[PDB]
């Protein structure tokens, strides 16, 4: 039995940029051609608690990361092409 | 400009246990008498892609982790489910 101390938990759960898995379809729903391999990507995005419900965990600095994704025409063609995805370099607890 | 190569992305996105932030309410609704600080916890849970939509990313080995959480006001321990090992199994 091991107990993570209050202040350890509060600190590591606090609003920060964290490796987050994001479905490529949910990101780009306008997609009527290609099934994606991988189906999802690991993106550094904001996430975590904020001290009081008044504040929300929001990104202060944003940017794109570029990844070789396999685009599959399920019956027809299939190739590796690059796709950009939003990522969050820095985050904050800001009032809603 | 920098490009992550296909096989790097496929591998890192693959079904694995990953630090996942989980709202303490959404886990335990039966506690409607308390506000929690922190509001959420970082838990090792399954997550990621599976090669084809037929399979779903599921836990093979499960267990509890214990954390000092502030219930509003006293600090008391709470167990949370965590996922030690994961797999791509057919739905």
């Amino acid at each position, epitope marked *: 039995h091991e107990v*993570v101390k209050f202040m350890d938990v509060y600190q590591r759960s606090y609003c920060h940029p964290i490796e987050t898995l994001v479905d490529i379809f949910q990101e780009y729903p306008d997609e009527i051609e290609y099934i994606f391999k991988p189906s999802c990507v690991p993106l550094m995005r904001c996430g975590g608690c904020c001290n009081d419900e008044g504040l929300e965990c929001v990104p202060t600095e944003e940017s794109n990361i570029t990844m070789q994704i396999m685009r599959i025409k399920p019956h027809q063609g299939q190739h590796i092409g690059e796709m950009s995805f939003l990522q969050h370099n820095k985050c904050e607890c800001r009032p809603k | 400009h920098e490009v992550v190569k296909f*096989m790097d992305v496929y*591998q890192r996105s693959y079904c694995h*246990p990953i*630090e996942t932030l989980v709202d303490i309410f959404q886990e335990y609704p039966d506690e409607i008498e308390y506000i929690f600080k922190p509001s959420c916890v*970082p838990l*090792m849970r399954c997550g990621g892609c599976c090669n084809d939509e037929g399979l779903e990313c599921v836990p*093979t080995e499960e267990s509890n*982790i214990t954390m000092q959480i502030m219930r509003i006001q006293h600090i008391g321990e709470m167990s949370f489910l965590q996922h030690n090992k994961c*797999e791509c199994r057919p739905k």
Partner: antibody
Amino acid sequence: QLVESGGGLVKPGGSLRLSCAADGWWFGYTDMSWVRQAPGKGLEWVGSISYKGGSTYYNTKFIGRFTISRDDDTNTLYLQMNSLRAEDTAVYYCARDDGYFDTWGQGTLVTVSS
Amino acid sequence: AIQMTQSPSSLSASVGDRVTITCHGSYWLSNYLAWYQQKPGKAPKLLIYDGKEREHGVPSRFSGSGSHEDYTLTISSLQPEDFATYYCQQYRYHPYTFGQGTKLEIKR
């Protein structure tokens, strides 16, 4: 104890199967890992297989490309390796998986070269 | 993926010295941690498992400790045969991850 065969020379891109023979029935009742180690560099878990065979698992840089197989009759563990590069030149150890690794083979050397 | 950070890379001690090797995990591991001794040319030998449990036959001068993230192999009275390379290994969360290694050199 545990005895690895299959190791030796392989062309880049080429495939190789490692077999590892365990001496006793106990093999049938434990998880089984492979750990590898590049010359002079350190240890690195490859992958494991579960007790009945229900589940296989892989370290990140092997997910697309290695398959772990197990024959609970002959008491033999297998590692199929495909798409081999220099990076994969290493001693490959068969080992008893229980979280920690209480039993190792002596390991076999897979050399990837032209 | 839990990142293990072993220290130092290497070190150098005389016979009889107490030696310390540290291991830090990126998440709380709750003693799901082992220490391995590897002598040159041969497979790893398990020393410590479950953080502080000593494998049968391992001398009493090798001891394990720590909790949460931070763990410590202690070789109490260093011997000439303890010349080896020590690794820590996490096994709480797949994939199993080891430290980078600690190459121990004897002075004389």
